[PDB]
Amino acid sequence: KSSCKRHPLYVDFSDVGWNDWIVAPPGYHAFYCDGECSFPLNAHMNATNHAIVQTLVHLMNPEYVPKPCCAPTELSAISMLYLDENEKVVLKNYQDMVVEGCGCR
Amino acid sequence: KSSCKRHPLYVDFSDVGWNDWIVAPPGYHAFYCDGECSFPLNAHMNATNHAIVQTLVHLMNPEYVPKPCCAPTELSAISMLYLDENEKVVLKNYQDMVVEGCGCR
Numbered sequence: 001k002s003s004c005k006r007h008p009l010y011v012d013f014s015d016v017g018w019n020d021w022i023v024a025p026p027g028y029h030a031f032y033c034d035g036e037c038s039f040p041l042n043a044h045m046n047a048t049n050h051a052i053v054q055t056l057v058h059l060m061n062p063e064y065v066p067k068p069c070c071a072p073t074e075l076s077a078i079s080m081l082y083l084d085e086n087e088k089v090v091l092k093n094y095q096d097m098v099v100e101g102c103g104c105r
Numbered sequence: 106k107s108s109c110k111r112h113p114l115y116v117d118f119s120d121v122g123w124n125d126w127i128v129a130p131p132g133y134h135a136f137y138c139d140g141e142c143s144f145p146l147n148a149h150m151n152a153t154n155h156a157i158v159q160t161l162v163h164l165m166n167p168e169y170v171p172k173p174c175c176a177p178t179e180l181s182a183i184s185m186l187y188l189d190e191n192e193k194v195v196l197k198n199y200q201d202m203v204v205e206g207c208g209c210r
């Protein structure tokens with residue numbers, strides 16, 4: 001309904017079933033992208049040139065071409081204590097877990 | 106309406122109203138991503154760990170959190186001859202123009 005932005009989402013690992021292997025943390029502030037990517041896209045929309053092109057194409061062909069979508073543009077990692085694929089409990093940074101910024105792609 | 110994948114698209118510059126500033130090309134093959142991040146039986150959804158976390162959360166709470174989006178994972182550049190600030194034909198390499206591949210983000 002509204003323009004593309006990041007929304008807050010706590011994820012409990014025991015709800016998703018990741019607590020079989022994740023010892024810490026019990027969950028995390030993963031956040032989620034939502035909102036519209038409508039013409040004209042501003043600097044804050046973190047758009048790609050293709051998202052700007054697709055924006056115009058959808059205006060004239062809304063039946064066949066979708067608008068660009070609101071997806072994470074910057075993801076960060078979280079440090080977690082977990083069971084390895086070698087049966088070892090390790091403290092490693094687990095990539096692409098947290099939304100830092102949203103954008104139109 | 107269908108499973109996340111890259112689709113073809115030819116963008117004609119006169120149709121988008123850009124024939125005035127882009128001296129060449131007249132258009133190009135931009136492609137677009139479309140489809141639901143449904144994780145089908147005989148397909149490989151390229152997905153970040155966030156998009157996997159968001160999928161799990163969506164399946165357990167569909168009314169609260171939307172599914173991750175079918176966004177471009179790889180984009181490529183195209184070169185264009187455009188009209189300068191001072192009205193002169195200039196060759197510039199336009200980044201993030203062509204969709205090379207799609208995935209769930």
Ligand SMILES: *[C@@H]1O[C@H](CO)[C@@H](O[C@@H]2O[C@H](CO)[C@@H](O[C@@H]3O[C@H](CO[C@H]4O[C@H](CO)[C@@H](O)[C@H](O)[C@@H]4O)[C@@H](O)[C@H](O[C@H]4O[C@H](CO)[C@@H](O)[C@H](O)[C@@H]4O[C@H]4O[C@H](CO)[C@@H](O)[C@H](O)[C@@H]4O)[C@@H]3O)[C@H](O)[C@H]2NC(C)=O)[C@H](O)[C@H]1NC(C)=O
Pocket residue numbers: 004005006029044045046073074098099100101102103
């Ligand atoms: C288009 O894209 C941009 C770029 O991503 C985006 O704007 C970005 O907004 C985000 C927040 O939405 C900004 O993120 C914050 O930035 C600071 C920067 O910190 C510097 O200093 C320290 C110390 O060395 C370092 O951590 C860092 O390396 C920097 O040099 C961070 O301090 C913020 O961290 C907090 O939030 C994180 C998650 O985002 C947590 O992981 C973290 O532990 C921090 O928690 C604090 O705030 C939380 C709320 O976010 C809260 O949960 C806690 O209670 C706590 O108080 C954070 O990373 C980012 O830098 C912006 N970047 C720019 C370039 O402006 C735009 O929003 C986007 N467009 C759209 C449409 O979304």
Ligand SMILES: *[C@@H]1O[C@H](CO)[C@@H](O)[C@H](O)[C@H]1NC(C)=O
Pocket residue numbers: 151152178179206208
């Ligand atoms: C997903 O896409 C990126 C960039 O196109 C690539 O580096 C990576 O190897 C891909 N992952 C899988 C599992 O196909």
